């Protein structure tokens, strides 16, 4: 037993590139919270997990508040629900297992996915002509949003 309770450097390995791994993110979704994993591998990568590593399960599933681990799924959309929070956690594990080596990982990501571009409307209505006027606002305070089509 090393008995190193303190007084050292602890951990000495790096998550470098040029290796088959997993990457979970979120983009391009219309007002209903989701996620999107990505698998940049080759030659029959195996199944993977997607746990719900929360304290009280605010990042809920639809009917039963499940984790629903995938199987040979690279990109999907975990259409969750929202039981009253603005922060989460997600322990994600993936048995890679390329060739004669049971390759695994466990990344405990912390994605929080409240909306940003909070948009309100107003119409005006004249005789046989019609106009909307759209209000555009950022749901967070003093973190800015650039915007380049509408």
């Amino acid at each position: 037993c090393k008995e190193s309770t303190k007084v050292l450097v602890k951990q000495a390995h790096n998550l470098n590139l040029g290796e088959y791994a997993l990457e979970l993110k979120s983009v391009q979704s219309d007002a209903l919270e989701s996620l999107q994993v990505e698998v940049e591998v080759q030659k029959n990568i195996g199944n993977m997990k997607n746990l719900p590593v929360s304290f009280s399960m605010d990042e809920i599933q639809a009917r039963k508040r499940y984790n629903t681990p995938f199987e040979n799924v690279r990109l999907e959309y975990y259409l969750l629900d929202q039981i009253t929070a603005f922060d989460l956690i997600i322990k994600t594990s993936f048995t890679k297992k390329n060739d004669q080596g049971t390759f695994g990982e466990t990344k405990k990501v912390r994605i929080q996915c409240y909306l940003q571009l909070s948009v309100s409307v107003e119409d005006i209505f004249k005789k046989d002509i019609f106009f909307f006027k759209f209000l555009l606002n950022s749901s967070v305070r003093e973190e800015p949003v650039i915007l380049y089509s509408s």
Binding site: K126, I129, F131
Partner: protein, 117 residues
Amino acid sequence: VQLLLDEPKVKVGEIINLKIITEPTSTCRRKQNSTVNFLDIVIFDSKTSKILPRSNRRILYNGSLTKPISTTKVSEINLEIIPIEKGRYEFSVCISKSNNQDGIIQFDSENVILSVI
């Protein structure tokens, strides 16, 4: 500053690019610090009493009007004055250097008027 416009005599349901043209000066040599300088565009009724940012049923536009210029060269700018149910408007600018209050340093007097039938 000059103000280059398409027409002064537009009907109601029509879209107009407005084009201000600004000329930074030799006597910008006092500062050089904020190369970016924030203007505004304010719309007056050609009686008194300018319309608010929420120009409801009067004039319509694309984006916030603040629309920065350089202290470098002849920058241009634009809006899209989608007119609605009006007559005899007025456009003029001011220069604000910053975003805060009491940042405003000059008020130009170039007042191009247009009519709406």
